[PDB]
């Protein structure tokens, strides 16, 4: 379901150009002078960049600049809807469990074939366990086709996002973007509180 949902990109364009222009002026003469880009998970640490008087932050200064110059950039964090529901990991051991499932069903199907004739009327092994293997191989092939559909959709997103299956820790990718959403809403509300206090 998440591979079928993940088909959309961009959104953030305008604030990253504003932060890089302000940030290259701050980092000029340092190692980070003339930086072509910066990390999206670093956006929580804009609040850590305090001023000289320690009354406003770089997060507060960019929010005050957007309130004055460009009053359309501030509608960015309402577009971030599935950022909070993108922080999980579930891979790897599904193949090992299904290979354990395929090995154990074949162990059951071998010993059903190798069992002798039932010498008692209470021995109801042969009727029900053949129906179990008929149930299990039907359910495993439902699982194997869905895992192949899981592997094809993971390979389709590998061609879509032009990435090989190595890149992970997406839960730390989107927690910082969700925390930047709450930090920017705090910084706009603090700047509106600071303007109302000065009035």
């Amino acid at each position: 379901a998440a591979c079928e949902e993940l088909r959309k990109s961009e959104n953030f364009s305008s604030l990253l150009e504003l932060t890089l222009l302000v940030g290259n002026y701050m980092n000029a003469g340092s190692r980070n002078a003339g930086a072509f880009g910066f990390n999206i998970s670093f956006l929580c640490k804009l609040r850590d960049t305090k001023s000289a008087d320690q009354k406003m932050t770089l997060l507060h200064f960019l929010a005050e600049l957007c309130e004055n110059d460009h009053p359309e950039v501030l509608k960015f964090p309402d577009e971030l809807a599935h950022v909070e529901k993108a922080s999980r990991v579930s891979a790897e051991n599904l193949q090992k469990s299904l290979d354990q499932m395929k090995k154990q069903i074949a162990d059951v199907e071998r010993d059903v074939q190798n069992f002798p004739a039932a010498t008692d009327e209470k021995d109801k092994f042969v009727e029900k366990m053949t129906s179990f293997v008929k149930d299990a191989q039907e359910q495993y092939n439902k699982l194997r086709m869905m895992h192949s559909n899981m592997e094809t959709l993971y390979k389709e997103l590998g061609d879509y996002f032009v990435f090989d299956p190595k890149k992970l820790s997406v839960e730390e990718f989107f927690m910082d973007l969700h925390n930047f959403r709450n930090m920017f809403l705090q910084a706009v509300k603090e700047n509106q509180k600071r303007r109302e206090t000065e009035e």
Partner: protein
């Protein structure tokens, strides 16, 4: 592609220290190749970024006492906070409700020499101008014959604690 604008500010500014992406690691269809941040350029923005993100008297004259004696007395006098003549009266009355072992043992350990206490007693007319450790040595210097008197003070205050220790030991053996 083009290199970024290498700014040269007059004042060194506070900066966020990110891990940058160089032009070798940029792809063709990345976001950073299409960045047009020079439309956001403003000299007032750089001016605001430059502007925002750029009785006690304690000496004390020590006429008689040295530095180490005056320091350790005033530490204990600050620990105890009694007036000096009140300390003199409780010693003279031998008030056993007030007096303890650790008060007396701190008094003997931080007591100055009797030659220093006699020299402090010779300058009683300048009592308000002396230091707080030196004010205590004047009031303790009001009693003369220091080492015989203080040992007699020491044994009397220890006698009640000695009787309360020795007597239940004898009764327990008996």
């Amino acid at each position: 592609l083009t290199p970024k604008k290498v700014y040269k500010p007059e004042v060194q500014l506070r900066r966020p220290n990110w891990s940058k992406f160089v032009a070798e690691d940029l792809s063709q269809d990345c976001f950073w190749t299409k960045v047009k941040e020079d439309r956001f350029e403003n000299n007032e923005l750089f001016a605001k970024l430059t502007l925002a993100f750029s009785q006690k008297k304690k000496v004390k004259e020590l006429k008689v006492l040295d530095s180490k004696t005056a320091q350790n007395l005033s530490i204990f006098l600050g620990s105890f906070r009694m007036p000096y003549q009140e300390i003199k009266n409780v010693i003279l009355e031998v008030n056993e409700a007030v007096l303890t072992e650790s008060m007396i043992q701190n008094l003997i350990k931080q007591m100055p020499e009797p030659e220093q206490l006699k020299m402090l007693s010779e300058l009683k007319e300048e009592y308000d101008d002396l230091a707080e450790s030196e004010q205590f040595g004047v009031v303790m210097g009001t009693v003369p014959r220091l080492r015989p008197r203080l040992n007699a003070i020491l044994f009397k205050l220890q006698f009640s604690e000695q009787v309360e220790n020795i007597k239940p030991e004898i009764v327990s053996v008996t």
